[PDB]
Design a protein around this ligand. Structure first.
Ligand SMILES: CCCCCCCCCCCCCC(=O)OC[C@H]1COP(=S)([S-])O1
Length: 580
């Protein structure tokens, strides 16, 4: 009858408002905070009016009609959101689609600087407005951020300030917490972005396949009914969120967490803790829940998936249920494999049955299918061993550098700041994953890689620079990582013209905290490869060694700039000779 009254009644005012603020923030990233609050308050007002007389004027309209209408009262300002104003001339669903198409994945807004004194005051004059502003700042930086999850993170941001503002040393309590919160936001956005991109680029099947694999790993005692259903509902949840239907997304998410906790014993022992919790914390806990123990009754698989006479029949009748079942069985027993590996393994099973079921004598053809998996397993296992050995030997910073060189050689057309971000991010994956118990390293490493590579692909969607990057980003979700891995130095590239000033340092660097000095040197590293792309990893290491020495010397001088001005250019010329 009235959809806006329904969702208002289901969600409650705080959540309704949060979710609407998040939605507007993602659709209209460039819009000031003030306009968004008015916009939310007005829509919220309308909802209440609709909740008490659902037959009032326009209470029967769809949400996207109401929300778009509303957005379009402010977005018409061409000055401030150019493209988006032509979205406003379209009726739904074209209009929504247009808005989605024009979301910015890299608006490059000012970095979020915690300010413990001024923020604690804001927190106290008006906490709801202060929370709203976190939602605003995060949402607009991350326009496919999981909606309801951002609300949960807003409760943690509040918790942080509630525990720190009254205490004596504010920044001491408060800054590490907020830096840790920022990890979790970055990582979570990257997780959700991967979901929406898989919808965009590959469709629903790709998402279900991914979800079946991962949910089976997580809930290996659940039988296939439970997994299947969960997958069906979680896919529908994320579909709705990716498509900007936040309110509907949050209702369906609540329904699902309720189901999962009513069927706790038939899904996983580990959900106990998650289920004796409130809505948002509950949902969150389920979504990040540890993997359950393996059951003692897992079936032999070969008996059914290799040896059985009746496979081609069991497969032609309902290939996706049959494959799903294969995928579920292989996945529940292999928490030690990455999700993408499990999918390569299933595409290989599928491929093998297409071949063998269209052949004279099929069973003799597919009797060795499980033997075709051994090489798919061994490649990433060894890749992870190798990256983890290198990381443990030399550490985060030099490991990042090595990846900066790897990726700059594969894609020297990418902008320096992006290649630095990638390499740094991937080194951070090294620090997360390589310390884990050995069987957990493959999945930690590839699943995180998938996210970083998707970030790079998304950036490439808006600023394309390399056919190689396009080729890897679009061929196939399962084949992404191995495809990036196989890129070798782009031989087409003409070395970037030497600009001495790029490699020339100054005293200003001396102020910077360690990790921003690092970024500057690593930028220079990427630029070093751009100009000398055949230089080996170790020539670059030595030259970078000499750069670091020199920065450290000159930063410790009486006259820092005289030291830089004198030595800097000698270093810059000589280091070109060292990269032949
Ligand atoms: C209605 C609920 C039914 C849930 C079970 C069905 C899920 C589909 C499982 C199919 C598995 C096929 C193997 C596979 O990995 O294919 C999906 C791939 C195809 O290319 P990508 S982009 S890697 O996704």
């Amino acid at each position: 009858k009235s959809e806006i009254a329904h969702r208002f009644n289901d969600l409650g005012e705080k959540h309704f408002k949060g979710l609407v603020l998040v939605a507007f923030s993602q659709y209209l990233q460039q819009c000031p905070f003030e306009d968004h609050v008015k916009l939310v308050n007005e829509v919220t007002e309308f909802a209440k009016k609709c909740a008490a007389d659902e037959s009032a004027e326009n209470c029967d309209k769809s949400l996207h009609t109401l929300f778009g209408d509303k957005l379009c009262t402010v977005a018409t300002l061409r000055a401030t959101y150019g493209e988006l104003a032509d979205c406003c001339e379209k009726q739904e669903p074209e209009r929504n689609e247009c808005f989605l198409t024009h979301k910015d994945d890299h608006p490059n807004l000012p970095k979020l600087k915690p300010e413990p004194d001024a923020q604690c005051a804001a927190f106290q004059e008006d906490p709801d407005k202060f929370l709203g502003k976190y939602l605003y700042e995060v949402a607009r930086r991350h326009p496919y951020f999981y909606g309801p999850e951002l609300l949960f993170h807003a409760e943690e941001y509040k918790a942080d300030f509630t525990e720190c503002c009254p205490a004596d040393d504010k920044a001491g309590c408060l800054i590490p917490k907020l830096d840790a919160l920022k990890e979790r936001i970055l990582l979570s956005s990257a997780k959700e972005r991967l979901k929406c991109s898989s919808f965009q680029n590959f469709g629903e099947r790709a998402v279900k396949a991914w979800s079946v694999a991962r949910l089976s790993q997580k809930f290996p005692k659940a039988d296939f009914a439970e997994v299947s259903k969960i997958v069906t509902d979680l896919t529908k949840v994320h579909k709705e969120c990716c498509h900007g239907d936040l309110l509907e997304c949050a209702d369906d998410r609540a329904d699902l967490a309720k189901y999962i906790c009513e069927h706790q014993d038939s899904i996983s022992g580990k959900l106990k803790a998650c289920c004796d919790k409130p809505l948002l914390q509950k949902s969150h806990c389920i979504a990040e829940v540890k993997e359950d123990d393996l059951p003692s009754d897992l079936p032999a698989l070969a008996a059914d998936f290799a040896e059985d006479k009746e496979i081609c029949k069991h497969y032609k009748d309902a290939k996706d249920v049959f494959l799903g079942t294969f995928l579920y069985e292989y996945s529940r027993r292999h928490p030690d494999y990455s999700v993408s590996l499990l999918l390569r393994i299933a595409k290989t099973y599928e491929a093998t049955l297409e071949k063998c079921c269209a052949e004279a004598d099929p069973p003799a053809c597919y009797a060795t299918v499980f033997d075709q998996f051994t090489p798919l397993v061994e490649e990433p296992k060894s890749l992870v061993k190798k990256n983890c050995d290198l990381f443990e030997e030399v550490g985060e910073y030099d490991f990042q550098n090595a990846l900066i060189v790897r990726y700059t050689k594969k894609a020297p057309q990418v902008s320096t700041p992006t290649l630095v971000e990638i390499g740094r991010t991937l080194g951070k994956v090294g620090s997360r994953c390589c310390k884990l118990p050995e069987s957990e390293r493959l999945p930690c490493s590839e699943n995180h890689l998938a996210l970083a590579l998707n970030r790079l692909c998304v950036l490439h969607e808006k600023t394309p620079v390399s056919e190689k990057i396009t080729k890897c980003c679009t061929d196939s979700l399962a084949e992404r990582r191995p495809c990036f891995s196989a890129l070798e130095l782009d031989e087409g590239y003409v070395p970037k013209e030497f600009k001495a000033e790029t490699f020339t340092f100054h005293a200003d660097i001396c102020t910077l905290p360690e990790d921003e000095k690092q970024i500057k040197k690593q930028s220079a590293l990427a630029e070093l490869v751009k100009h000398k792309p055949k230089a080996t990893k170790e020539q670059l290491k030595t030259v970078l060694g000499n750069f670091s020495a020199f920065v450290a010397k000159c930063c410790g001088a009486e006259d820092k700039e005289a030291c830089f001005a004198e030595e800097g250019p000698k270093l810059v010329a000589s280091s070109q000779l060292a990269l032949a």
